[PDB]
Structures are given as C-alpha cells and as structure tokens.
Amino acid sequence: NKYKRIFLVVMDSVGIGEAPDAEQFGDLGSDTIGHIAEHMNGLQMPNMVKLGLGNIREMKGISKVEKPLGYYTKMQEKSTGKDTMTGHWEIMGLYIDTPFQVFPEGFPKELLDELEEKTGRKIIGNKPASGTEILDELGQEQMETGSLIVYTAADSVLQIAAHEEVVPLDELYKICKIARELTLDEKYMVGRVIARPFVGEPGNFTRTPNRHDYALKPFGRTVMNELKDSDYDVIAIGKISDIYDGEGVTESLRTKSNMDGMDKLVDTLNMDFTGLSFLNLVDFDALFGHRRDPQGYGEALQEYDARLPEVFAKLKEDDLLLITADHGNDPIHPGTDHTREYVPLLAYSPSMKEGGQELPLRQTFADIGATVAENFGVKMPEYGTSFLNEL
Ligand SMILES: O=P(O)(O)OC[C@H]1O[C@H](O)[C@H](O)[C@@H]1O
Ligand SMILES: [Mn+2]
Ligand SMILES: [Mn+2]
Ligand SMILES: [Mn+2]
C-alpha cells in the first residue's frame, strides 16, 4: 500500500459555497463557511488554513497560503439528494438517484393511513418537533389512548414515540419495522425510522435508552464493504456506522460531541491498524446548521481547528488524512433544510515534504472512495476517479 492508514474526516454539513445545480434545490446564495466567516468577522481556523482551506476559497479570516501542508480542491455532488446518507454513500463509491425526503408540513395522509391500517393504532402529532417538547404536548394523550406520537425533525426522519408501560417495547419495535418497510417508497422516502420509547408522567417524561434506529442499507456495496471483505480494518467513529447501517464496518466507536469525535480520532491514531479510520463530526449539522445558528457553528469550527495540531503530530509518513464534508447546511439560509453546496477536500500526509498543490475539482464525492480503494488494492467503485497518484 502507498498508505497504511487513511483517516477520513467528514465535517458534517461544512459546505464551501453553492453548487452548479443549487437553483434546482432553492439553494442559490448558499455558502456555509463563507457566511459563518462573515458572521464571525473572520473565522479563526489557522490549521485548516495551513492545510490549504483558503487555497480552495478565500473567505473572511481564511486566507490562502504559499505552501499548503497538503493537496486541496473541492468536490461536486452528483447524486440527486443533499442529505447525509446520500453524501456519505457517494463518498464511499455510490451514485444515488432517489433523494430522501424531508417533511416540514408532516407526513402525507397516505403514509399515515397505511401505518394505521397495518398497526391498528391511531397516529397523533404528525409535525416537525423537538422530541422532548412533543412528549410534553402529547405524551399524556398518548398514555390515555394507546396512540402513537409520530413526528419528524429538520432532516429525513420518522420518529415514533410511545410510553413503555402503555405500548410494550417489542410492539413499538414491530411498529417501527412496519414504518421502515412503508417508507421504502419514493412517494415518501425517509432516511431513518426511530423508535422513541419514553417513561414517566405528565410534566416529567423521560426518553429511555431503549431508542432504536432503523436505517436503510446503502444502495450498493461500498468501498467499506470491499475493505472489510479484504480483511482491512474499517473503524467507524461517531454516526458513521449508523449512516452505512454497519456495512463494511469492523469496529465502531460512539462519540457524544465533536471534541469527543476528535478524541476517538486520536485513539485510532494510537491503534495499530491497516485500513480506514472514518470520523463524522456531526455537531455542525445537528446543533448549528439546522438551528440556523451561525455563532455556535463558527465557535464549533474554531474548537475543531484548535484540535488539529495534535492530529498533525501523530500522523506517520504512511498515513493519509482526508478532510471533507457531505453537503452544506448554511446557518444563514431560509428554512431548516441542507444546502446544495460544493464541499472542501484537503489531503495531507507528513510524507508530502514539499507541501501540496491544487487537485482538479472532484466531479463526484465518489473520488474519495475511488482513492481509498486504489490505495488498498481492492475492487474499484463503479463511480469516482482516484486522486491517489496526484498525491
Ligand atoms: O431529539 P429529537 O428532537 O427527538 O430528534 C432530533 C434528532 O435526533 C436524532 O439525531 C435524529 O437525527 C433527529 O433528527
Ligand atoms: Mn435552500
Ligand atoms: Mn450530513
Ligand atoms: Mn442534517
């Protein structure tokens, strides 16, 4: 192998400006990092800068450097959707024609009707809501009627809440599996179905650790699958395992925050493995992008950047670090949905003694998967062009 270990970091939703097809999605004007940099009166990200972030695009406080640490460019998304699953599945070598849907007005009557008809239960709620706020509003009614609280969030999810002493866990799990089947339908294509059991009484409800997530398998065998099948390590950190429904994953490390994600990254740097370590930093999307909070987003980016010098110190000559994003989620943009954006790509190894250069723009996110696959000598994905030889 050219590289023994590849550390792939997805800064979730950290887009670098509207994609050529942004208008189709109502994303004209969108610029995640650029709008954040403006809000912050200059983003402090000196380590991303040293890697060549400003060389991709200059933004407030983010300037180009004469000798970037590694190679740099941006990537264009080819798949129809702008969601996390689409982005990650494309990164690992797929092409996804069918987008996952978001439901700001709640779910279609048709879907809920069929869910009722299959389960023998009434559905209440049917709206975007915080999980905790909807229990306060409708938890008592749920308890008294044996109905199901169905709700959504800013991303492609269908969540079913039911009290554990009213609807038995196994019944809630069966109901969610039915929901999972019904939502494999392009009329209402949902990324995840999530069981949200809760306990307690009105004014004091608690969601339990019995939460279960029902994900779809990626629409194809990914580069992770091929790595796993050739006896390589695939270490998934954070939401990664869930995003791929465990496909091609050899070890999974749960994280609770971006900082904890960077701690697990460092943990993997300390591991003797050959293969891929794959981190998702999800806070950017989950806490700041959808909530349209440029200040919190800006601060999180600065907190993330400050962690990088330790990563740089631990990388070996035969390690490659790849930093990218899966889509945009501009926190100063109308509505609550992702934004169709280019994503940055930074590729760094300490073996790059003279620093890096600009790469041709990646025409699909799958160029990452192709690069990883060529590196480890496994079956090349159907889509994507490797940049391994450019490094
Ligand atoms: O905590 P809740 O409001 O029920 O759900 C919000 C999000 O929490 C989970 O990560 C899913 O991504 C949901 O979109
Ligand atoms: Mn938009
Ligand atoms: Mn994402
Ligand atoms: Mn999201």
Side-chain angles (χ1 to χ4, degrees), residues 85-106:
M85 276 150 78
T86 296
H88 289 258
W89 296 357
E90 194 173 316
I91 282 159
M92 281 294 133
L94 302 181
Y95 169 73
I96 314 295
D97 178 75
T98 310
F100 298 93
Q101 305 266 120
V102 295
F103 299 92
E105 332 285 333

Side-chain angles (χ1 to χ4, degrees), residues 319-338:
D319 294 342
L320 179 70
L321 174 66
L322 302 176
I323 300 168
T324 200
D326 57 329
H327 48 84
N329 193 357
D330 179 347
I332 310 174
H333 188 78
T336 64
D337 192 12
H338 297 155

Side-chain angles (χ1 to χ4, degrees), residues 9 11 14 16 33 44-56 62-63 65 68-69 72 301 304-306 308-309 312 321 323-324 344-346:
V9 175
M11 304 172 295
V14 187
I16 198 152
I33 303 167
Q44 299 173 233
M45 296 187 78
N47 298 116
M48 288 293 278
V49 160
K50 286 184 189 190
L51 280 175
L53 182 60
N55 290 250
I56 301 166
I62 301 161
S63 285
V65 297
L69 281 171
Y72 58 93
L301 287 166
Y304 156 75
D305 192 86
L308 291 171
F312 299 163
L321 174 66
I323 300 168
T324 200
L345 176 55
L346 295 168

Side-chain angles (χ1 to χ4, degrees), residues 274-293:
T274 305
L276 176 73
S277 170
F278 194 174
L279 167 74
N280 185 104
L281 297 162
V282 74
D283 290 357
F284 302 126
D285 187 77
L287 305 184
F288 312 115
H290 290 290
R291 292 174 208 188
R292 296 305 197 247
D293 175 16

